[PDB]
Amino acid sequence: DLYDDDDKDHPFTMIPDSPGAVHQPPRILLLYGSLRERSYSRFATLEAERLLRHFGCETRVFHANGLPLPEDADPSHPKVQELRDLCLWSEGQVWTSPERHGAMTGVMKSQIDWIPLSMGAIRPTQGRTLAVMQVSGGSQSFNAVNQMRVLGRWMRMLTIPNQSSVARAYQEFDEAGRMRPSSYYDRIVDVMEELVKFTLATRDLSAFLTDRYSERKEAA
Amino acid sequence: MGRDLYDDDDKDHPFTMIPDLSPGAVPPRILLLYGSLRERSYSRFATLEAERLLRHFGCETRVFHANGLPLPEDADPSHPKVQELRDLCLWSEGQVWTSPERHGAMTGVMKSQIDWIPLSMGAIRPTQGRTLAVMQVSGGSQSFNAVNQMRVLGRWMRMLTIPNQSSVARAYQEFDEAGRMRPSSYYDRIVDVMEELVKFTLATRDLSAFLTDRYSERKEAAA
Amino acid sequence: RDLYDDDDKDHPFTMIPDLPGAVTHPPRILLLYGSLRERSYSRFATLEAERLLRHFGCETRVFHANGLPLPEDADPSHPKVQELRDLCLWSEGQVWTSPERHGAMTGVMKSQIDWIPLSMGAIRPTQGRTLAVMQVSGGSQSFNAVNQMRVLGRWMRMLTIPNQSSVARAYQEFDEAGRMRPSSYYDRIVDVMEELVKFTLATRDLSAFLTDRYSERKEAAA
Amino acid sequence: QQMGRDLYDDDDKDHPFTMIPDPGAVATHPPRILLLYGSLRERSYSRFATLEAERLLRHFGCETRVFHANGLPLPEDADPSHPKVQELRDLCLWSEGQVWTSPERHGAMTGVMKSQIDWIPLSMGAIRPTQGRTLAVMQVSGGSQSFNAVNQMRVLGRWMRMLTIPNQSSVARAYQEFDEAGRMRPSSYYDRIVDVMEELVKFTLATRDLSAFLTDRYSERKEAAAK
C-alpha cells in the first residue's frame, strides 16, 4: 500500500525538497579531440577557459599527449590517473571536440572511456555539469555535440542545453590562437555563462539529486 | 566612463554579467503520452503511471492526447488541438515525453506534437527553461534510439533534459489488461526518473528566467 | 563430417552467395514529406530531384502527405494511407527529403514512414529498395535529419546510398517559382540522384536474392 | 543566360559532364578486413565475435585479415610513419569490404574504434582508402540489446563514403554467449551474425567490380572541365 501505487516500497520513498551553500567552481575542460600541433579545439578550449576564469571558476585543462588507447595499458598509467583525479576534482566539465569523419573524435571518446562510471567509493562524473562544444573545418554541423550529449547522459552528468558549433574554425583563430570576434565566440560565451550558472544552482544538491528510490529500495 | 577587459578583447564590457536572488513557489508537469494513439497503448499506460508517481511527489499534472491532431501545417494553427497543446506547454514547468520505438526511432506522433510548438511565439518561448524527462516503450529489446533522438530534440527545444531516462523492454509483458504496470526494475527506473525530474524542476523553476539571460541577447543592445 | 569449425550452423540451410533472372525504367518514388507548407523548400528540392531522375531514365512518382492523419488517428482504410503503401510497394528506390525542424526529421516525414508497416503479412514494402536521404534547412548545413533517416533506412531494411544532400539556407537557393539556382548544393543533389540510379540498377534484380537469409531458411521446420 | 548549346528543363546542368548509368569482372575471393577494435581487453567479446565472423567469412569464400589495435597511439600522438598506423592503412587499401565490431562502452562506440577510423584519411592525396568498400556494423554489449554503437558506425560509414549494408548485429550480454575458448554458443544472435556476413559478401561481390564506376560523379567530371 502506497497511496494508489502498488509496487512502491513505502519506506524507500522520499519527497523531493534542503539547505547548503559553497565557496569556489572547479571546471575541467577536455580540449580532447586533437593532439594536433595547431588544434582549433585546443584554442577554443583555452578561450572557454579565459571566459570561465572571468566568470569566477577555477579551471584545469587536461592534455592527452601520451595517453594510451583505452585498456592498452594498466590504469596505473600517469596520464590515466591524472585524468581520473582531475575529473574527481571537477564539479562541471567542458568537452570540445572537432568533427572528424562526421563524429566526435577517437581521442575524446578514448578519454571518456578511461573514466569508470564508479571508481570504488567515488563516482567521478555523476551529478557534475557538462557543456559540449565542437569545431569543424567545414559547415556548422552537430554530429559531435549530439554524440557527446548522449554520452553525457550515459555519464549521469547534467548536460546543459546550450552548445556551440564552430564552422570552418581555421578562419576564426589568428596565428597566435586567439579567436576573432564572431557570433561563434558569443555563443561560446553564452555557453560558459550558462555552465557556471547551472553549476552554482546544482553543485550543492548533487548528493541529494543522486539519492534515488531504486538505490534506497535495495536496502534489503 | 566604462569599458574594456584584460585578456578578452571580444567582449562587450557592459553586456557581461557574473553568474550569481529569487524566491520559492507553490509544480506543473505536462505529460505527452504521444507516440501511439493505438487503443491499447503501452506508452499511454506508462505515461499514466508516471503521472501517478508525479502527483504522489506533489505535482499538478496535465496529460495531452494527440487524437485528432493534424500533421504540422495540415491545418491552421487555430486548430483546437494545436492551441490546447501550445497552452498546456506554456503552462508547463517540466515535461515528460514517452514514445514507443517505431522503426527503431521516435514516432511521428511525438515529433509532430513537438513540431506544432514554435520555439518562439513572438516574445514568448514556450519550451525554454522547462525541465524534461524522456522515456520510451518497446515491443522488443531495451534500446535507446527513441530516447536518444528525444534527448537531442530536448537540446533543440532549449529544455533541461534530466540525465536518467526509462526504456521499457517488451512493454506488453509489463501491463495488465487494466493498464497498471507490474512490479519490475522498469517501474523502479520510472520512479527514479519522476523523482529526479521533480527535484530538478524545483531546483530550477524559480531561476529559469535568470538562467536564460544570455550575454549574446544583452549584447544585442543595438538601439 | 558434419561441419568445419562452425558448430552452431544447420548445414542444410547454408548457402554460399555468388552471382545469382537478369534485366526497365526504374521506379523511384520521392517522399517530399517534411513540409505541408505551401511554399516548402523540401518540396522544391524534391521536384528538382525528380527532374534529374527522369533525365537519368527513371519513372518517378511523388507522394504528397496533404490530409494524411497522424499514425492511427484514422483507419488504414484512409485513401492517403493506401496510396502511400501502394506507391511504396511500386517503388524500387526512394528519396526522403526532410527539412530540419527542431534539429531533426519532421513529424510529417516520420509519420509517413510510420504508416508503412515493415511487414504487411507476407510482403515487406521497404525491403531491398534503395534509398537516398536529403535535407533542407533554413540555417546552417547540418546533418541531423539525414543522419536520423539514414538509420531509419536500416530499420526499414532499405539500402541507403552513401552520398546525401544537405541544403543550407534553402530560402536563398530557390527563386519564387521553385527552381533552384546553380550551386554546390544543386550539384550535390545531382550527384546523389546519379548514385541512387546507379545503385538501384545494381540491386533491383538481386533484391529477392539479397533477402534470402540463413535465418529464414533455417526455420524450415517440418 | 549564356547556357552552352544543349539543355532541356535543367538550366543548371552542365550538359558536358552528364552521363547515363551503366562491365563484368571477377581478388576473386573478396578481401574483407575485420576491425575487432573497440576493446583491447584481454578477454574481449568484441574480439571473439570478430573471429567467429571471420570464420564464417572464410567459409563463404572471403580472404580475411584482422587488425589488432594493440600499441596503436591516439590519433596524432605519433608520426603516421608509425608501424601500427601504416599496417592499418595498408590493410584498408587492400580491403574491398570491412566489418566494424565495437562494444557499447558508455552508450556509444569506443574511442579505440573511432581512433582507428580517425587514423584513416578520407583522401591521402589521390587515393580514397575507404571509398566504395562495403561495410558491416556489429556491436557487443554487457547489458540489453541496444544499437547506439551500430548507429554511430552506420553514420560514420557514410562519412567514410562506404556502402553500409542494411543488416547489423547487436549481441546483448555477450558474456552469456561465449565459451572460455572464445566460440559463440548457438543463439539467434549467432544466426543474425551469419546473416550479416552473408549479406556483406553478397553486396561485396555485387559492387566491388563497379565501385570505380559508382564513384564517378557528375561533380568531379564537371570540375575536370578547366581552361
Residue numbers in the entry:
A (entry chain D): 24 to 40, 45 to 51, 63 to 258
B (entry chain C): 21 to 40, 44 to 49, 63 to 259
C (entry chain A): 23 to 42, 47 to 49, 61 to 259
D (entry chain B): 19 to 40, 46 to 49, 60 to 260
The publication says:
P. denitrificans ArsH was produced in E. coli as an N-terminal 6xHis tag fusion, purified by affinity chromatography and crystallized by the sitting-drop vapor-diffusion technique. The asymmetric unit of the crystal structure of P. denitrificans ArsH contains four monomers, named A, B, C and D, tightly packed together into a tetramer. A dimer is the usual form of flavodoxins and a dimer of dimers is assumed to be a biological assembly of S. flexneri ArsH. The same holds for P. denitrificans ArsH. The pairs A, B and C, D thus can form structurally cohesive dimers and the dimer–dimer interaction is dictated by the combined A-C and B-D interfaces. Each individual monomer comprises a five-stranded parallel β-sheet surrounded by five α-helices and a short helical loop rich in hydrogen bonds. The structure of the monomer can be divided into two sections, the main body, where the β-sheet and its flaking α-helices are located and where the active site is predicted to be, and the C and N terminals that form a structure binding to the neighbor monomer. The sequence GSLRERSYS located in the β1-α1 loop and N-terminus of α1 (the underlined letters represent the residues conserved in ArsH proteins) matches the consensus site GSXRXXS for binding of the phosphate group of FMN. The β4-α4 loop protruding over the presumed FMN binding site carries residues that are highly conserved among the ArsH proteins and partly conform to the consensus sequence [VICL]-X-[IVC]-X-G-G-X2-[VIL]-[YFA]-X2-[AFMCLV]-[LMIVF] derived from the proteins known to specifically bind NADP+. ArsH appears to be less sensitive towards product inhibition possibly because its two cysteine residues are well separated in the amino acid sequence and located spatially far away from the flavin cofactor-binding region.
